[PDB]
Amino acid sequence: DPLPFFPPLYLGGPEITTENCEREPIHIPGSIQPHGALLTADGHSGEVLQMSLNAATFLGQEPTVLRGQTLAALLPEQWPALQAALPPGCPDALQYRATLDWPAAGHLSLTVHRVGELLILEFEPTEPHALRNAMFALESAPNLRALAEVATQTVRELTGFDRVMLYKFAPDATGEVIAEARREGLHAFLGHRFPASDIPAQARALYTRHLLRLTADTRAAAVPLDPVLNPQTNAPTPLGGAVLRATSPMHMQYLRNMGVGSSLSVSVVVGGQLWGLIACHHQTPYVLPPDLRTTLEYLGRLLSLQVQVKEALEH
Amino acid sequence: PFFPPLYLGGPEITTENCEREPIHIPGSIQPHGALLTADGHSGEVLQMSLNAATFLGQEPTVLRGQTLAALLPEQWPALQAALPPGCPDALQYRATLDWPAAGHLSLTVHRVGELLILEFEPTEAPHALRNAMFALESAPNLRALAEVATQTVRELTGFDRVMLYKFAPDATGEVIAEARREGLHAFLGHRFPASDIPAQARALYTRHLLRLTADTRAAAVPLDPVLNPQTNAPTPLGGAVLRATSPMHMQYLRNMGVGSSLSVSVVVGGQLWGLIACHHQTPYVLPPDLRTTLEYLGRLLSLQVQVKEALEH
Ligand SMILES: *C/C=C1/C(=C/c2[nH]c(/C=C3[NH+]=C(/C=C4\NC(=O)C(C=C)=C4C)C(C)=C\3CCC(=O)O)c(CCC(=O)O)c2C)NC(=O)[C@H]1C
Ligand SMILES: *C/C=C1/C(=C/c2[nH]c(/C=C3[NH+]=C(/C=C4\NC(=O)C(C=C)=C4C)C(C)=C\3CCC(=O)O)c(CCC(=O)O)c2C)NC(=O)[C@H]1C
C-alpha cells in the first residue's frame, strides 16, 4: 500500500523498520557522506546558509568565516557562470559542474544545482578513447543480451568494481540480474530475481529523475548539515539531487550484510520509466572520482537509447 | 543503381543524375589527413594516399610493402580484437599514437569485409559536455531543445553557423533552429527541396553519422592504387571521415560562401530525423577529440528528440 512520507528522524519521525519501508523520506536525511562537503546558498543574494560539519576541512576555512561571506566573494569566477547556467525556476535535475583550484585542498570538483530559491554546492576532490570505443561497440551489439554483456564488461573495465550487474525491472517492480561481470571467486547473481520491496517505491521514483547515486563506504557515519533545517523555510533541505546525500541506513545495513563496502548504480530510463539499473559492488570502500563518474553517466544515456533500439528489434 | 565512378570512365555528375553519384567510392581523401588500407589477416598495406609520406614521415615504397605488425606493434593486436572478421563497417576503433615524425596522431580504423581502413590525423594532449548534456535534458520542449543544441555546438566549436535541419516526410528539409555569428544571412525558417541531400546520401548518413568538408577549395588526394588489389574494385570509403566530398556538394558550399562544413546525423526509430549542420566561412579542421564530443551529442540529441516528441504526441 502506498502511503505518504514520515517526517525525518530529526523532526521526531519514527525509526524505519521492515514494516514502514516505503515511507522513509530518503530525500531529506539532513546529512551527507564524508568524502565531500556541501554548502547551501540563497539563490539571489548568494548568502551561505547551511554547510556540512566537515566543510572547514575541505575548504580550509572556519565556519563563521564561510557563513559570513556571499558566493560572489567566495567564488568570484564561478558565481556569474552559476547564475547564467541555473536560472530561477529551472528544474532541480539540471546540474552545472566546474573544476576549482583551491589553495588548501588541491583540485576540487564543484557540482551545483538549484532547488527553488536554494543553490546546493557539492565539493569533492578530483584527479583515453575508451568511451568512444565503447560507444561504437554498444551500438554494434547484435541483440539485447550481447548489449547487456558488453555494457557490464565495459563498466567493470573502466571502474575496477568487483561486480557490475545489469538489473532489470519487471512490470511488478521485481528485478532480475540479466547480465553481470564479476571478479574471480565471487558467486554469480545472474538469473536470480529479487522482490519488489528490495528497492521501495519512493526510491524508484527518485531514480527516474536523478540518475546516479552511490555509497562510497557502507560503514561511514553521515555528516550533518549545520544548521539541519534550511533557515529560509525552517524546513528540511531537499537533497534528492545531491550525490553526496547520505544513504538510507536500511539500505546500508542491507549492503553490509552482503559484504559490500561500496555501491554505485546508474539508472536506465526508457519511455519515461525506470527500465533497469547499472548496479556496481566493491568489497572494500571505494571512491570513484567525479570525472570517471561522468563517463558512467554518459553510458547510462547511451544504454537507454540502445535498449530502446534493441527492444524495437523484437516484437 | 549507381553510375561507375569517374576514374572507371563513368558519366560526370549533373543535376540530371543527382541520385546516381557513387559518393562512397571516390578513390580519394581530403588532404588534412592520410589513409592506408590493409589486409585483415596479414596486416599487409595494400593502398595508401599519395600524401602518406608527409604525415607518416616514411619513404614512399617502405609503406606499401610493410605490415601493420611491423608498422604499429602495440596497436596491431588491439585492432585484431576490436574489429573481428564479420563485424559491421560502422564499428570503429580509435587510438592516439606518439609517432616520431608527428608529435601525436589520431588513428581511426574500421573494417569492410577483408580490408582494414586506417585514418591518420594530427591530434593533441572539460565539463562543457556534461553541462550540455544536463541542459539538453532540462529543455522543456522540442523548440527549446533545438535552440540549446545549436547554441551548445556553436560554443564548443566556434563554427560560424550551426543549424538543426529537420527532414519532412518527403525529405523536404527545414531549418528549425540556428546559432550564428553576427553578420551572416539567417537560414532560420527556410525550407529546401529533398534533392539537396539526395537519397543515396541520406541512406549513407543513416549508418555513418558524421561527415565534413574541411576546406571547400582543397583538391582531393588519390589512393594508390585506386582499386583494391584484393578485389580489383573500388575501396568503400563511406565509413571514412577523410573520404573525398562530392564535387557536386562542394560546388553547392562554395556558391553559398562556405569554406568549411560539418554535420551530425540525428537518427530516431532507425530513420534519419535531422542533421546538426555546421558552417564556417573559412577552412577549418576540427580536431578528432572535439569531433568525438559532437558524436556524443548526436546520440544524446537522438534520445532527447524522441523523449520530447513523445510529450507532444
Ligand atoms: C525496509 C526497506 C528495505 C530496503 C530499502 C531501500 N533500498 C534502496 C535501494 C537499493 N536497493 C538495492 C538492492 C539490491 N542490490 C543488489 O545487488 C540486489 C540483488 C542482487 C538487490 C535487490 C539497490 C541496488 C538499490 C539501489 C542503489 C545501489 O545500491 O546502488 C533504498 C534507497 C537508498 C538511497 O538512495 O539512499 C532503500 C531505502 N531494501 C530492502 O531490502 C528492505 C529491507
Ligand atoms: C545534383 C545534386 C545536388 C546535391 C548533392 C549532394 N548533397 C549532399 C549533401 C548535403 N547537401 C546539403 C544541403 C544543404 N546545406 C544547407 O546548409 C542547406 C540549407 C540551408 C541545404 C539545403 C547538406 C546539409 C548536405 C550534408 C553534408 C554536410 O554536412 O555538408 C551530398 C553528399 C556529399 C557527401 O556526403 O560527400 C551530395 C552528393 N546537392 C544539391 O543541392 C544538388 C544540386
Task: Check A93 against B302: CB less than 8 A apart.
Answer: no
Is any ligand 1 atom within 6 A of the Cβ of residue A247? yes
CATH 3.30.450.20 in chain A, residues? 1-125+219-247
- For residues A287 and A249, the answer to whether their CB atoms sit within 8 Å is no
Is any ligand 1 atom within 6 A of the Cβ of residue A22? no
B91: cell is 564499428
DSSP β-ladder status, A106-115 and A212-215? unpaired
Task: Check B127 against A98: CB less than 8 A apart.
Answer: yes
> Cα(B260)–Cα(B215) distance, rounded to whole angstroms?
5
A218: cell is 557502507
Class of domain A1-125+219-247: alpha beta
* Residues of chain A contacting residue B108, judged by C-beta atoms under 8 Å apart: none
Residue B123 contacts A, CB cutoff 8 Å: no
| β partners of residue B98 | none
Q: Provide the phi-psi class of A239: left if phi over 0, else alpha when psi is between -120 and 50, else beta.
A: alpha
A84: cell is 547564467
Is any ligand 2 atom within 6 A of the Cβ of residue B248? yes
- For residues B226 and B46, the answer to whether their CB atoms sit within 8 Å is no
CATH 3.30.450.20 in chain B, residues? 1-122+217-245
User: Cα(A173) to centroid of ligand 1, in Å?
Assistant: 13
Is any ligand 2 atom within 6 A of the Cβ of residue B304? no
* Residues of chain B contacting residue A141, judged by C-beta atoms under 8 Å apart: none
Task: Check B138 against A297: CB less than 8 A apart.
Answer: no
Angle of helix A130-140 versus helix A144-159 axis, rounded to 10: 170
Residue B179 burial (C-beta neighbours within 10 Å; 0-12, 13-18, 19+): buried
CATH 3.30.450.40 in chain A, residues? 126-218+248-315
B87 assigned to a ligand binding site:
no
User: Cα(A32) to centroid of ligand 1, in Å?
Assistant: 18
* H or E segment to which residue A145 belongs: helix A144-159
User: Cα(A251) to centroid of ligand 1, in Å?
Assistant: 5
Could you count the other beta carbons within 10 Å of the beta carbon of residue A270? 15
Cβ contacts of residue A309 below 8 Å, gap of 6+? B270
User: Cα(B259) to centroid of ligand 2, in Å?
Assistant: 14
DSSP state of A301: H
- For residues B282 and B259, the answer to whether their CB atoms sit within 8 Å is yes
> Cα(B290)–Cα(B60) distance, rounded to whole angstroms?
31
Task: Check B134 against A308: CB less than 8 A apart.
Answer: no
Is any ligand 2 atom within 6 A of the Cβ of residue B32? no
Cα nearest neighbour of A293 on chain B: B130
Residue that the C-alpha cell 543549424 belongs to? B163
DSSP β-ladder status, B191-192 and B210-213? unpaired
> Cα(B89)–Cα(B83) distance, rounded to whole angstroms?
9
* Residues of chain A contacting residue B130, judged by C-beta atoms under 8 Å apart: 95, 97, 294, 297
DSSP state of A246: P
Name the method of structure determination: X-ray
Could you count the other beta carbons within 10 Å of the beta carbon of residue A89? 6
Residue that the C-alpha cell 544571412 belongs to? B185
Least Cα separation, residue B13 to chain A (angstroms): 34
Is any ligand 2 atom within 6 A of the Cβ of residue B211? yes
- For residues A2 and A201, the answer to whether their CB atoms sit within 8 Å is yes
> Cα(A224)–Cα(B32) distance, rounded to whole angstroms?
57
CATH 3.30.450.40 in chain B, residues? 123-216+246-313
What is the amino acid identity at position A244? L
CATH node for B1-122+217-245: 3.30.450.20
3-state secondary structure chain B: CCCCCHHHCCCCCCCCCHHHCCCCCCCEECCCCEEEEEECCCCEEEEEECCHHHHHCCCHHHHHHCEHHHHCCCHHHHHHHHCCCCCCCCCCEEEEEEECCEEEEEEEEEEECCEEEEEEEECCCCCHHHHHHHHHHHCCCHHHHHHHHHHHHHHHHCCCEEEEEEECCCCCEEEEEEEECCCCCCCCCCEECHHHCCHHHHHHHHHCCEEEECCCCCCCEEEECCEECCCCEECCCCCCCCECCCHHHHHHHHHCCCCEEEEEEEEECCEEEEEEEEEECCCCCCCHHHHHHHHHHHHHHHHHHHHHHHCCC
Question: Please, what is the Cα angle at A155 between A149 and A159, to 5 degrees?
Answer: 150
Is residue A310 classed as helix, strand or coil in its secondary structure? helix
Is domain A126-218+248-315 given the CATH code 3.40.50.10490 in the classification? no
DSSP β-ladder status, A223-226 and A31-32? antiparallel
Is residue A294 classed as helix, strand or coil in its secondary structure? helix
What is the amino acid identity at position B251? Q
Of A192, A151, A154, give the one whose Cα is nearest residue A170: A192
Resolution of the model in angstroms: 2.1
Cβ contacts of residue A197 below 8 Å, gap of 6+? A21, A22
Is residue A206 classed as helix, strand or coil in its secondary structure? helix
Residue A100 contacts B, CB cutoff 8 Å: no
Give first-to-last CA distance, chain B, whole Å.
38
Cα nearest neighbour of B289 on chain A: A129
* Residues of chain B contacting residue A82, judged by C-beta atoms under 8 Å apart: none
Class of domain B123-216+246-313: alpha beta
- Buried/exposed B189-220: b ≥16 CB within 10 Å, e otherwise: eeeeeeeebbebbbebbeebbbbbbbbbebeb
Residue that the C-alpha cell 544513504 belongs to? A247
| β partners of residue B117 | B37, B110
